[PDB]
C-alpha cells in the first residue's frame, strides 16, 4: 500500500485500545503526527504468536531473513493485534503460506515469490518430491482453540520515506481548545489579530 495525496491523523489509530502490541522505533511515538514526511509505506501479512518478537532490526531467524528483512536504518512503525475469530476456523485453516528454505540472504524491502524447489544435495531433481529436494513453501498450523503463542496475528508495518520532495502525507495543524472573553491572540487565515 502507498499513501499519497492524502492527509490523516494518527490519534485515532492509537485510542482503539485493542492492539496486543505496538512497537515503533526511529521517532518518538508521541511526536510523529507533527513531523512531516513524503511517503507512507504499509504492508499487511499474518504471523504466528511466537514470531512477533522477530519483527525487529538486528537479529537472525527463519521469517525475518527469508520473507522480509529489516534494515538498520529502519524508521518503521509496526502494529499487530489478535483477530483470531475471523482469520481462523475449525477443521484447520491453512489458507496462508510461508517460505522456510532459501538459497541465500535477501536485501530488505524486497518480495520473494519464487516457487522453485530448493535443492539441498548436489544432484538435480527436475521437480520431484524425492531425495535432497524439498518444497520451500510450507503450510501453517492455525487453529482457534490454541493458546496465545501460536494464534494468527495481523501484523503491519508503517514506514516513512525522507527524500528531496515536499510533504505530501502528514499531520495537519491540530485543533486546540477554544477560549473566549479573554485577551488572546488568534489568526483565522488572514490576520494575526489580538483581542477578546
Amino acid at each position, epitope marked *: 500500500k502507498r499513501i499519497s495525496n492524502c492527509v490523516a491523523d494518527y*490519534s485515532v489509530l*492509537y*485510542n482503539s*485500545a*485493542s*492492539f*496486543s*502490541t*505496538f*512497537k515503533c*522505533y526511529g521517532v*518518538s*511515538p*508521541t511526536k510523529l503526527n507533527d513531523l512531516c514526511f513524503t511517503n507512507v509505506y504499509a504492508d499487511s501479512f499474518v504471523i504466528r504468536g511466537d514470531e*512477533v*518478537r522477530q519483527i*525487529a532490526p538486528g*537479529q537472525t531467524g527463519k521469517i525475518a531473513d527469508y520473507n522480509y528483512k529489516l534494515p538498520d536504518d529502519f524508521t518503521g512503525c509496526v502494529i499487530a493485534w489478535n483477530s483470531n475469530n475471523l482469520d481462523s476456523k475449525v477443521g484447520g485453516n491453512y489458507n496462508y503460506l510461508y517460505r522456510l528454505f532459501r538459497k541465500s540472504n535477501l536485501k530488505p524491502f524486497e518480495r520473494d515469490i519464487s516457487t522453485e524447489i530448493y535443492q539441498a544435495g548436489s544432484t538435480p531433481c527436475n521437480g520431484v518430491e524425492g531425495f535432497n529436494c524439498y518444497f520451500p513453501l510450507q503450510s501453517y498450523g492455525f487453529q482457534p482453540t490454541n493458546g*496465545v503463542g501460536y494464534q494468527p496475528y495481523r501484523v503491519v508495518v508503517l514506514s516513512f520515506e525522507l527524500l528531496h520532495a515536499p510533504a505530501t502525507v502528514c499531520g495537519p495543524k491540530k485543533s*486546540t*481548545n477554544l477560549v473566549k472573553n479573554k485577551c488572546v491572540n488568534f489568526n483565522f487565515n488572514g490576520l494575526t489579530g489580538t483581542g477578546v
Partner: antibody
Amino acid sequence: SGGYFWSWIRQPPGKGLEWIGCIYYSGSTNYNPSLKSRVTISVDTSKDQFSLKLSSVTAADTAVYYCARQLWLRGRFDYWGQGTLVTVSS
Amino acid sequence: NFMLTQPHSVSESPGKTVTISCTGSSGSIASNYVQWYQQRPGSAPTTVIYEDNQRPSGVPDRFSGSIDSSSNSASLTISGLKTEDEADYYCQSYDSSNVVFG
C-alpha cells in the same frame, strides 16, 4: 484539550507501584483485573479535575495514591503528583 | 496473567557498572514499551528512561537500557554509581489495556 489520558496509581509503603485504572476525557475507562467492579472514576471538565471512587475498602488498601498525566497511554507518565497518605484502620 | 519479575535487592559500590533486569512471564518483553521509574522515598516517582533506548532531557547519560527479547528480560544499565542514585526502580508494561508494573 491535547488528547491525553489520566490515571490513578497507588503505592503501599515498602511495596511496588500498583496500577488502578485509566480514564479519557470522554467515558472511556479501563481498570486493573484485580480491581474490577470496585473502581469508579469520573471526569468533570467544568471544574477542571477528575475524581476516583473506591468501594469496599479494606485494611490492605493502605497505599500512597498518585495521579499522573499520561501523555502516551501504553507509555510513561510525564508528570507525577504528590502522593497523599491514606490509612484504613479503627 | 503477565507479571514483571524484578530483583528485589541490588547492591554495588559507586563508580562501577551494574545491570538491573526486568523479566516478563507470559508476554514477550519486546512486544510492549518498558518504562523505568526512579523514585526517592518520600517523593513522587520520576521517569528515568523510556522507549527502551530513549533518555529524558535532564537525567544523566549513564541511565541506559537494553532489551533481550530472547530471554524475555528488560535490562537497565547503570554506570558510575553516585549518592543521589539510591532510589527505587520499577519497570512498567501495558499488555492489553492493563498497565502492569515491576
